[PDB]
Amino acid sequence: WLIKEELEEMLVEKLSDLDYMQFIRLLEKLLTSQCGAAEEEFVQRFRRSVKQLIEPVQYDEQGMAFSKSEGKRKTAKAEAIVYKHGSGRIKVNGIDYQLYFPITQDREQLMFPFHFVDRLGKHDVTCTVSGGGRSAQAGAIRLAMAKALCSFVTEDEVEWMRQAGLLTTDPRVRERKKPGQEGARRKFTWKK
Amino acid sequence: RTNENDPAKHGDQHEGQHYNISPQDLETVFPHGLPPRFVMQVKTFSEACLMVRKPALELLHYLKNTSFAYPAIRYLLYGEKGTGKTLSLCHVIHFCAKQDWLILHIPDAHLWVKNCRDLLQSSYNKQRFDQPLEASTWLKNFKTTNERFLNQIKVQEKYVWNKRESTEKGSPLGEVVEQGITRVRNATDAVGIVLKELKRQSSLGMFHLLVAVDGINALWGRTTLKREDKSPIAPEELALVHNLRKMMKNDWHGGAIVSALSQTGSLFKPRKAYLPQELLGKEGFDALDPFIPILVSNYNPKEFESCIQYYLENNWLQHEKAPTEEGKKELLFLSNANPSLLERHCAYL
Numbered sequence: 223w224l225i226k227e228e229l230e231e232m233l234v235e236k237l238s239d240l241d242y243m244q245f246i247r248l249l250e251k252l253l254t255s256q257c258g259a260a261e262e263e264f265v266q267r268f269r270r271s272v273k274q275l276i277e278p279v280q281y282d283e284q285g286m287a288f289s290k291s292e293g294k295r296k297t298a299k300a301e302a303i304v305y306k307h308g309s310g311r312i313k314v315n316g317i318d319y320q321l322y323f324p325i326t327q328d329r330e331q332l333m334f335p336f337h338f339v340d341r342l343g344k345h346d347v348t349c350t351v352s353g354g355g356r357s358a359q360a361g362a363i364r365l366a367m368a369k370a371l372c373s374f375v376t377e378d379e380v381e382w383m384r385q386a387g388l389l390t391t392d393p394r395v396r397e398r399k400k401p402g403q404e405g406a407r408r409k410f411t412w413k414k
Numbered sequence: 415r416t417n418e419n420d421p422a423k424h425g426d427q428h429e430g431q432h433y434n435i436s437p438q439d440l441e442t443v444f445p446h447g448l449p450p451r452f453v454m455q456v457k458t459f460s461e462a463c464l465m466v467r468k469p470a471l472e473l474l475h476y477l478k479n480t481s482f483a484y485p486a487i488r489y490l491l492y493g494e495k496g497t498g499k500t501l502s503l504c505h506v507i508h509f510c511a512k513q514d515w516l517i518l519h520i521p522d523a524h525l526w527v528k529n530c531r532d533l534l535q536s537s538y539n540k541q542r543f544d545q546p547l548e549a550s551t552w553l554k555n556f557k558t559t560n561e562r563f564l565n566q567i568k569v570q571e572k573y574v575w576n577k578r579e580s581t582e583k584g585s586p587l588g589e590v591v592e593q594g595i596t597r598v599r600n601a602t603d604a605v606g607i608v609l610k611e612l613k614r615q616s617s618l619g620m621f622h623l624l625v626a627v628d629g630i631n632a633l634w635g636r637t638t639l640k641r642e643d644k645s646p647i648a649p650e651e652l653a654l655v656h657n658l659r660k661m662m663k664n665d666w667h668g669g670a671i672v673s674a675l676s677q678t679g680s681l682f683k684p685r686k687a688y689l690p691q692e693l694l695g696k697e698g699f700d701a702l703d704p705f706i707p708i709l710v711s712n713y714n715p716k717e718f719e720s721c722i723q724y725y726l727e728n729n730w731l732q733h734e735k736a737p738t739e740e741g742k743k744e745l746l747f748l749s750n751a752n753p754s755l756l757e758r759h760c761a762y763l
């Protein structure tokens with residue numbers, strides 16, 4: 223339904239929220255009354271019209287298929303190339319993941335998308351990451367790899383991945399320190 | 415697991431197949447040098463099964479085809495962190511022990527170049543420093559390992575431990591070993607004399623000699639030890655390091671030298687350093703040159719499956735879902751087939 227501002231613009235008259243609510247209730251009753259085409263088109267004067275995108279598969283020098291994607295987490299930024307076939311080998315900055323991420327937590331973060339879509343070992347990946355710490359880089363690589371994998375997994379799997387949260391860029395970033403307080407929210411010890 | 419528990423008879427057909435080591439053999443052969451985590455696994459399982467891997471098989475084949483007339487050949491177990499280099503060296507050590515060689519085994523050279531508080535200037539040579547605690551600790555395990563061959567060795571000189579006490583030519587090397595073990599102040603000198611006598615007697619033909627040193631890069635990597643003036647101490651100034659460099663020199667025959675690179679416990683070396691020049695420095699590379707490097711890498715699929723089967727047979731993977739192929743793939747991904755990471759992961763499952 224057109225908002226009170228739109229209704230005011232149409233009626234060149236100031237309105238109160240109560241008046242607008244009364245009018246909207248009357249319109250709802252009209253529509254529910256099983257009206258005719260003339261009434262429906264009259265109501266259309268007041269009615270107001272209100273998924274993940276998949277990267278395109280490409281082919282390497284040997285013609286073997288791959289997909290490319292990018293992602294960011296905290297200050298970290300990563301770009302991932304996921305090939306259609308492989309033994310699960312992931313090379314970050316040219317270093318195998320088990321050596322680039324000594325932390326089992328970050329290795330689990332890398333694992334998460336493939337494990338979700340039941341593809342452990344079914345692809346090889348080459349990722350380049352920069353900025354942020356170990357965990358930020360792991361998250362960024364996870365996001366990039368998931369976005370690339372969307373190029374291969376079915377649409378049902380893509381939607382399931384989105385619902386699991388593998389394809390949402392985590393907006394949570396550091397909050398600026400404010401003057402007169404210790405940190406983003408830690409105020410100074412109230413003196414007495 | 416292999417029905418062939420003989421270290422010499424098992425071959426390529428046993429690749430990825432297990433290989434048992436009896437508790438008597440463990441007590442007699444490995445009083446030291448086993449990885450701490452593998453020692454814990456042995457204590458837990460009452461077993462010492464090692465997987466027969468390609469690097470160990472190749473090194474065993476080289477040792478079998480050796481010709482003792484030539485100067486001692488230097489082999490270098492090599493590769494990434496926690497890929498089984500130390501356990502491959504242990505496998506070769508057990509093979510030679512069952513073949514009746516004198517096993518001069520250095521479990522970890524890194525322990526000798528850090529944390530020492532008993533460091534003292536060597537009385538026999540003020541230029542160098544002695545490490546009596548480490549010397550005695552190594553000597554005890556060396557005697558435990560090679561007691562039977564110890565009596566047979568005839569010392570060829572007179573070694574004076576004091577102005578009043580000495581050991582005479584024609585005496586068993588057990589005399590020197592016992593002197594070093596008991597009189598702690600003379601342990602380092604006893605170790606040096608033992609290295610000298612073993613190296614020369616191997617050439618004389620008295621017995622086949624296998625030098626087996628882990629963390630060989632420590633013989634040239636910088637030490638963290640300090641003088642009385644808080645000044646750093648170069649590796650050669652340690653008597654043990656000096657004598658072990660002399661042993662590593664290939665100017666002798668009647669044996670073989672096997673050294674294993676190890677970034678773990680190394681001093682002033684980045685984590686991702688696994689190349690031989692990178693770990694040994696140029697000095698160490700030239701000292702050990704020429705040498706045969708033997709690469710040890712992550713488990714192949716068959717080795718991974720065999721190790722997982724061993725753990726399941728022992729019921730170590732108590733986790734409910736571990737036996738499932740989903741859990742198998744999860745472990746494979748997380749460890750990326752690295753034996754050390756896989757063992758650490760299965761430790762708490």
Ligand SMILES: Nc1ncnc2c1ncn2[C@@H]1O[C@H](COP(=O)(O)OP(=O)(O)OP(=O)(O)O)[C@@H](O)[C@H]1O
Binds near residue numbers: 455678
């Ligand atoms: N051939 C093998 N048979 C059985 N277990 C093995 C083997 N190789 C590695 N392991 C496992 O991995 C560990 C042994 O790895 P090892 O101590 O040899 O590491 P390394 O890579 O040579 O060097 P480092 O860890 O010092 O860098 C143990 O936990 C053991 O269970």
Ligand SMILES: Nc1nc2c(ncn2[C@@H]2O[C@H](COP(=O)(O)OP(=O)(O)O)[C@@H](O)[C@H]2O)c(=O)[nH]1
Binds near residue numbers: 538572573575602604
């Ligand atoms: N105390 C003592 N140590 C000896 C003796 N002979 C050999 N050693 C040991 O072996 C070292 C000598 O090795 P050698 O081959 O003579 O060469 P060097 O080390 O350059 O003198 C000494 O520093 C000791 O560690 C000896 O008579 N007395």
Ligand SMILES: [Mg+2]
Binds near residue numbers: 499501
């Ligand atoms: Mg090791």
